[PDB]
């Protein structure tokens, strides 16, 4: 009964939420209509139905409307499926000031109605990104209105990080640097994904050319099911949800860690070669398998949290952890000689039917807080500097209420965030 | 002279109305299925951690580090049965012996058994199986 | 053994009560051709409360159906249940009622003694026992505040001891039908004070409001509007009619709720109301019915109950129920909301239990409430009186049939003196 | 004190009205026919 | 929830808007007498954007014909219209439909910038609607004269609409002779091709696509400064009766013909042009690494020619519902420096209006620099 609220907001978080509630329903005996022929995510009504704990709030009409006509329409409360009128047009003053202000009285009651129903609530699972007027601006509306009400509670957001070399938005860095302006105050674990690496993970290991978006929602789906297995399945070494705010963040603005999942493999390679415990954690650290676009060889790992799963034995884990920490390649930080953290559970890696994965007995999920992501913040304000110099694209953000008085105020705050990988990276004597 | 089917009308769950005709070359149902709308048992691969599927070797090499299982739990090494104290074990239990071997076992282990009872015990043991079987069938029946 | 006499009058009362004798039909399992079909023998032992007997097992209701028109008795016989009603007790009038309370009350005052009084004494004396007298008139019409509300002062002249229980339909200005509603409804609430102890109040805007906010149906007819009152009227006698745990009756609901002889204007409610799309997603248990029970949107008289403190509050219950939490949330709502109850009275809540849930439900909880914000109903209908009286505009219909100007001034001269009691004890 | 409302509960203001196939205001609660089922009177 | 009021003003706008209504009606499955055909459930979900219905399966558009009209009603789909608003008053009918509407967003006015009806009455009526609904987007499709009247017309229009589409018949003719091998350019074919280019960008308003971007978002994305708003259209997968079996169909193939210079709607020069903002709206069932990779690969092939001092010089959109017949299609739209040549010729061809045109030419020059 360590429950969480699982909102899916913006477009870039709801198709994953399609794939998120597939993977929870297939894991158990719950059908799409919610009848079981679970208590973390699901509320149960005595007629025979189960109802998930998920509110699907977005301004865009069709992506919620494709669910109410979809094959999962008999799952949710149909008052949770909340829609406004017009989209936020990737404009911060449209998804947070002019159209987003109309829907905040409703969704203050809806997080209150679910939490009055829950008993041992332990936090939130919001699913957003870092580019949206209704995906990055509007999640900073549903964040500051909760810490004034719920306050001390464990918030885990899965946010598509803006990639180094690819993107599709244009006026993106004006409010991404405004997203971080308040989520430094009120977010405690804001996980991030670049999709550019998963574009190439499929091309090397998975025997995949031409991958869609439906494949990346499943691999993001597993990482959410890897971190939430320790609530619905008792294990040898549990990791609960208040423990993530003492394992990971060492100083209160360094709370942005990575994620990967090692034995992504097809059915013709996994048949040929085995999978021990001492090699799926060796496959974690190799630079061709992290799911976020980064090269870890220039980065010193601060605090891994290896989440194992399936058929593992705890001496096989500690045999493998000392082989790896003696390696001369991968570097660490001197004032964290502890370093790692394990989690072992007795529930296997699931498989979606009709998928591309193979039935592997063991699968791991390492969630590495690292150093190397600081130089990906060198480029996210270098991009911001050039547009803002000539006042380019400002003529619309000033259209709906915002002014120039905040855009430089945010840049110094993202300048001060880049400094805090240098007071802590330069070692004491 | 009419069809036996006349549909409901309101989209909400209505008063009757006729079925609207879809004209030829204007059926777009088979072509306009959105993949998102579309979005709306097997063998097992790898090795087991116990390696019970492979047969066990008779005489082990020194280099043998594989997991076989014959080494039981530490509780079964710290409080052994007298069989394990006498050096006999579960493969000697589960091995296929002979009719004459079981017949020599019967009158020499201290059990006097009728011939029909021995035939019934062998039948019940073979029905119980897809020594342990003989002792279990003799204890139950 | 405690038989209940229902007096249905008017174009209202023969189409409101025409839904009321339908939930009495299925909760006793009565076929629309007279005989009972069912299996459970709990509901024919107290069949005599509402259903007299004849030969061949046939059950006709104790019913009075009167009008000054022949208009609506060509409609109540035209429903599905028209064969059930008794043949002689449709008491006709070949002429028309015609919107005025002057034609029914004094011109047809001498007509009603042959009409309704001679059918009631034929009937109500013939029962082996009696309990009370329950009439439903529209205040704003011609027959209900005509023939009917004079009878409220006629049978009460014969038998003073019994209990009057008027589900009264007071109009509202927003949804309106006739422009002279200060001339037929103001001229009847002066008579209700002396002669009707238990006086409910039903509105026509709050009833559409309930079928907008709650049941979410977009084009509500009158038939959907009249089951939110027909469940209420059947749901108040759930202990005179069925077994249970803590039975109550129409004296036990009046001792708790009438502290003073003129502080007796109640207002209704009905608990388990939820929409057409989310049926199974709501868990109908005790703490959700009592959260539906108390708020402003659920209550059937169109008033905001927050401006005025409840002097007293009643309830009733049904269904296989555990007593503890029922008696516990009504310990909280008196305690947390001390602002919206008066002081100087220790207890303010009454509860009563039955055993059988209604048709197709598991629990139910009808609400009856005496609040001191019913003066909001009776200030707006006197706000418009003397703002119309000063031009005397529609008076020339009333000096021509037998009532003076001088009884017009007294009907509002005591209307304020009703409100002068609710305001003092606020 | 007022209490919160969703979209298109009262209809005291006058709206144009569509057939419920078109996904419009207050579509779902009129799409679903109201359902009830009973077996008998309990004991 | 987006809404549209469509007005055909002036003759050329009348005959192109007629083909507009024919194209949207065939894509939505309505018999021209007005009855609905419901082969798929996606056809009627957002018909509220462009239509209001009638009793008995009949539908009728939100369109006013103001200026020919007997010829239009005698044409293919005249019977759908409302015969009470054929005005030739305009204020009363525009508030009638815009007051019966719920939440308004944008207006589709078909006119020209070269004549006495499409220009002066166009500017008058855009003034008369911007004075009534100051929070909408006026998509005013326009035809300008060939560089081989508008100065009177445009200098209130550039203040008001910002969504005009001005290159024309010479480019249309050369498209028809070269990339189609189409021997006889009829007027109706050009009306057809402009009308399909209209309908290409109206699927994020009517269908659930994948990257859903409505008209206000398009305005914020495309227009940097409030006076640089004249845009360049084009429709990609066009070919002849022969070359279909010789060509293939992929996202890298339609990228070639949406950035083909001979395909765009322009008698202009991208070799002298520099695109500030590009949007490529795709329709069909297509994988999206192909879309994004081909996007930035064709931006990678030209570093000079897409604009400098802008990191992402392009934008893609995609919907899940293709056109009729074709498995997938593309429509390219641009905002370049390749358009002031028309302004230079039309200015070398009152005086404060000419000065304001010289201001706009210098505005392009000082921002290209």
From Swiss-Prot, chain A:
Signal peptide: none annotated. Pfam families: Tubulin, Tubulin_C. It is found in: Cytoplasm, Cytoskeleton; Cytoplasm, Cytoskeleton, Flagellum axoneme. SMART domains: Tubulin, Tubulin_C. This is Tubulin alpha-1A chain. Disulfide bonds: none annotated. Its cofactor is Mg(2+). Mg(2+) binds at residue 60. It catalyses: GTP + H2O = GDP + phosphate + H(+). The modification Phosphoserine is found at residue 428.
UniProtKB/Swiss-Prot annotation, chain B:
It comes from the Eukaryota. It is found in: Cytoplasm, Cytoskeleton, Cilium axoneme; Cytoplasm, Cytoskeleton, Flagellum axoneme; Cytoplasm. Microtubule inner protein component of sperm flagellar doublet microtubules. Interacts with STIM1 and ORAI1; the interactions take place upon Ca(2+)-store depletion and dissociate through a Ca(2+)-dependent mechanism. Interaction with STIM1 inhibits STIM1 interaction with SARAF. Microtubule inner protein (MIP) part of the dynein-decorated doublet microtubules (DMTs) in cilia axoneme, which is required for motile cilia beating. Cytosolic sensor for calcium, modulates the interaction of STIM1 and ORAI1 upon store depletion and the activation of store-operated Ca(2+) entry (SOCE) and NFAT translocation from cytosol to nucleus. This is EF-hand domain-containing family member B. The gene is Efhb. The chain holds residues 686 to 841 of 853 of the full protein.
Curated annotation (Swiss-Prot), chain C:
PROSITE patterns: TUBULIN (PS00227), TUBULIN_B_AUTOREG (PS00228). GO terms for molecular function: double-stranded RNA binding; GTP binding; GTPase activity; metal ion binding; structural constituent of cytoskeleton. A motif (MREI motif) lies at residues 1-4. GO terms for biological process: flagellated sperm motility; microtubule-based process. InterPro entries: Beta-tubulin_BS, Beta_tubulin, Tub_FtsZ_C, Tubulin, Tubulin/FtsZ-like_C, Tubulin/FtsZ_2-layer-sand-dom, Tubulin/FtsZ_GTPase_sf, Tubulin_C. One of its GO terms (cellular component) is axonemal microtubule. Keywords: Acetylation, Cell projection, Cilium, Cytoplasm, Cytoskeleton, Flagellum, GTP-binding, Isopeptide bond, Magnesium, Metal-binding, Microtubule, Nucleotide-binding, Phosphoprotein. GTP binds at residues 11, 69, 138, 142-144, 204, 226. Its main location: cytoplasm. It comes from the Eukaryota. Pfam families: Tubulin (PF00091), Tubulin_C (PF03953). Widely expressed. Expressed in the retina and the cochlea. The modification Phosphoserine is found at residue 172. Its cofactor is Mg(2+). It is found in: Cytoplasm, Cytoskeleton; Cytoplasm, Cytoskeleton, Flagellum axoneme. The keyword RNA-binding does not apply. The modification Phosphothreonine is found at residue 55. The modification N6-acetyllysine is found at residue 58. Mg(2+) binds at residue 69. PANTHER family: TUBULIN. Belongs to the tubulin family. Tubulin is the major constituent of microtubules, a cylinder consisting of laterally associated linear protofilaments composed of alpha- and beta-tubulin heterodimers. Microtubules grow by the addition of GTP-tubulin dimers to the microtubule end, where a stabilizing cap forms. Below the cap, tubulin dimers are in GDP-bound state, owing to GTPase activity of alpha-tubulin. This is Tubulin beta-4B chain.
UniProtKB/Swiss-Prot annotation, chain D:
The keyword Cytoplasm applies. GO terms for cellular component: axonemal A tubule inner sheath; axonemal microtubule; sperm flagellum. It is found in: Cytoplasm, Cytoskeleton, Cilium axoneme; Cytoplasm, Cytoskeleton, Flagellum axoneme. Keywords: Cell projection, Cilium, Cytoplasm, Cytoskeleton, Flagellum. The keyword Chaperone does not apply. Signal peptide: none annotated. Its main location: cytoplasm. Microtubule inner protein component of sperm flagellar doublet microtubules. Microtubule inner protein (MIP) part of the dynein-decorated doublet microtubules (DMTs) in cilia axoneme, which is required for motile cilia beating. This is Cilia- and flagella-associated protein 107. The gene is Cfap107. The chain holds residues 7 to 49 of 196 of the full protein.
């Amino acid at each position: 009964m360590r429950e969480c609220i699982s909102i899916h907001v913006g477009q870039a978080g709801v198709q994953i939420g399609n794939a998120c509630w597939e993977l929870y329903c297939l894991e158990h005996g719950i059908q799409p209509d919610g009848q079981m022929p679970f208590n973390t995510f699901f509320s149960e009504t005595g007629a025979g139905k189960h109802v998930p704990r998920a509110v699907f709030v977005d301004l865009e009409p069709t992506v919620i409307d494709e669910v109410r006509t979809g094959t999962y329409r008999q799952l949710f409360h149909p008052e949770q499926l909340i829609t406004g009128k017009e989209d936020a047009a990737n404009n911060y003053a449209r998804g947070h000031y002019t159209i987003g202000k109309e829907i905040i009285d409703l969704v203050l009651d809806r997080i209150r109605k679910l939490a009055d129903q829950c008993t041992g609530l332990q936090g939130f699972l919001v699913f957003h990104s870092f580019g949206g007027g209704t995906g990055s601006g509007f999640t900073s509306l549903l964040m500051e209105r909760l810490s004034v009400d719920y306050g001390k509670k464990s918030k885990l957001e899965f946010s598509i990080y803006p990639a180094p070399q690819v993107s599709t938005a244009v006026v993106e860095p004006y409010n991404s640097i405004l997203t971080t302006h308040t989520t430094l105050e009120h977010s405690d674990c804001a996980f991030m994904v670049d999709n550019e690496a998963i574009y190439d993970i499929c091309r090397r290991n998975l025997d995949i050319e031409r991958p869609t978006y439906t494949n990346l929602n499943r691999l993001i789906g597993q990482i959410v099911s890897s971190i939430t297995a320790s609530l619905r399945f008792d294990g040898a070494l549990n990791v609960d949800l208040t423990e993530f705010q003492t394992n990971l963040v060492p100083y209160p603005r360094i709370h942005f860690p990575l994620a990967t999942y090692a034995p992504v493999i097809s059915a013709e390679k996994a048949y040929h070669e085995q999978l021990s415990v001492a090699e799926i954690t060796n496959a974690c650290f190799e630079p061709a398998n992290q799911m976020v676009k980064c090269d870890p060889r220039h980065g010193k790992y601060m605090a891994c949290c290896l989440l194992y799963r399936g058929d593992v034995v705890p001496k096989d884990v500690n045999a493998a952890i000392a082989t790896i920490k003696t390696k001369r390649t991968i570097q660490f930080v001197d004032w964290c000689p502890t370093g790692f953290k394990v989690g072992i559970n007795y529930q296997p890696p699931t498989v979606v039917p009709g998928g591309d994965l193979a039935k592997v007995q063991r699968a791991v999920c390492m969630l590495s807080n690292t150093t190397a992501i600081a130089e990906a913040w060198a480029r996210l304000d270098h991009k911001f500097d050039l547009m803002y110099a000539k006042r380019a694209f400002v003529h619309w953000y000033v259209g709906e209420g915002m002014e120039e008085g905040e855009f430089s105020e945010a840049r110094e705050d993202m300048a001060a965030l880049e400094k805090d990988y240098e007071e802590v990276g330069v070692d004491s004597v | 002279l009419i069809n036996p089917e006349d549909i409901v009308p309101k989209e909400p769950g209505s008063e009757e109305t006729l079925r609207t005709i879809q004209r030829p070359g204007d059926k777009v149902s088979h072509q306009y299925k959105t993949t998102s709308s579309e979005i709306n048992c097997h063998p097992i691969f790898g090795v087991p951690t116990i390696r019970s599927d492979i047969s066990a070797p008779r005489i082990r090499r020194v280099s043998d580090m594989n997991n076989y299982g014959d080494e039981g739990n530490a509780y079964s090494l710290l409080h052994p049965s007298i069989f394990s104290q006498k050096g006999v074990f579960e493969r000697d239990f589960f091995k296929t012996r002979s009719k004459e071997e079981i017949s020599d076992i019967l009158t020499n282990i201290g059990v006097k058994l009728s011939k029909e009872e021995f035939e019934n015990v062998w039948n019940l043991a073979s029905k119980k199986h897809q020594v342990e079987t003989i002792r279990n069938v003799l204890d139950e029946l | 053994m405690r038989e209940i006499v229902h007096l249905q009058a008017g174009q209202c009362g023969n189409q409101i009560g025409a839904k009321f004798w339908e939930v009495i039909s299925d909760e006793h399992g009565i076929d629309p051709t007279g005989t009972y079909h069912g299996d459970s023998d709990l509901q024919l032992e107290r069949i005599n409360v509402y259903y007299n007997e004849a030969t061949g097992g046939k059950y006709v209701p104790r019913a009075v159906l009167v009008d000054l028109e022949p208009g609506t008795m060509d409609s109540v016989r035209s429903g599905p249940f028209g064969q059930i009603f008794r043949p002689d007790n449709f008491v006709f009038g070949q002429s028309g009622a015609g919107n005025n309370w002057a034609k029914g009350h004094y011109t047809e005052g001498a007509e009603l003694v042959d009409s309704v009084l001679d059918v009631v004494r034929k009937e109500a004396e013939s029962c082996d026992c009696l309990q009370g007298f329950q009439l439903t008139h529209s205040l704003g019409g011609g027959t209900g505040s005509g023939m009917g509300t004079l009878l409220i002062s006629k049978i009460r002249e014969e038998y003073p001891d019994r209990i009057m229980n008027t589900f009264s339909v007071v109009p509202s200005p927003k949804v309106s039908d006739t422009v002279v509603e200060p001339y037929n409804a103001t001229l009847s609430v002066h008579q209700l004070v002396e002669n009707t102890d238990e006086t409910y109040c039903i509105d026509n805007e709050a009833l559409y409001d309930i079928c907008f906010r709650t049941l979410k149906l977009t084009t509500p007819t009158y038939g959907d509007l009249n089951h939110l009152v027909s469940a209420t009227m059947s749901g108040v006698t759930t202990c005179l009619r069925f077994p249970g745990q803590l039975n109550a009756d129409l004296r036990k609901l009046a001792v708790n709720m009438v502290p003073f002889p003129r502080l007796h204007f109640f207002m209704p409610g009905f608990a388990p109301l939820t929409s057409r799309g989310s049926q199974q997603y709501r868990a109908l248990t005790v703490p959700e019915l009592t959260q539906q029970m108390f708020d402003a949107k659920n209550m059937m008289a169109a008033c905001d109950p927050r401006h005025g403190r409840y002097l007293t509050v009643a309830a009733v219950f049904r269904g296989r129920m555990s007593m503890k939490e029922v008696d516990e949330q009504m310990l909280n709502v008196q305690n947390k909301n001390s602002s919206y109850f008066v002081e100087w009275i220790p207890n303010n809540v009454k509860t009563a239990v039955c055993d059988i849930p209604p048709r197709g439900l598991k629990m139910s909880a009808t609400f009856i409430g005496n609040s001191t914000a019913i003066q909001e109903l009776f200030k707006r209908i006197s706000e418009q009186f003397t703002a119309m009286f000063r031009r005397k505009a529609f008076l020339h219909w009333y000096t021509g049939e037998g009532m003076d100007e001088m009884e017009f001034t007294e009907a509002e001269s005591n209307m304020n003196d009703l409100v002068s009691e609710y305001q003092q004890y606020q | 004190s007022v209490v919160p409302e969703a979209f298109s509960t009262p209809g005291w203001q006058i709206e144009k009205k569509y057939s419920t196939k078109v996904l419009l205001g207050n579509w779902v609660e009129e799409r679903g026919k109201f359902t009830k089922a009973i077996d008998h009177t309990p004991q």
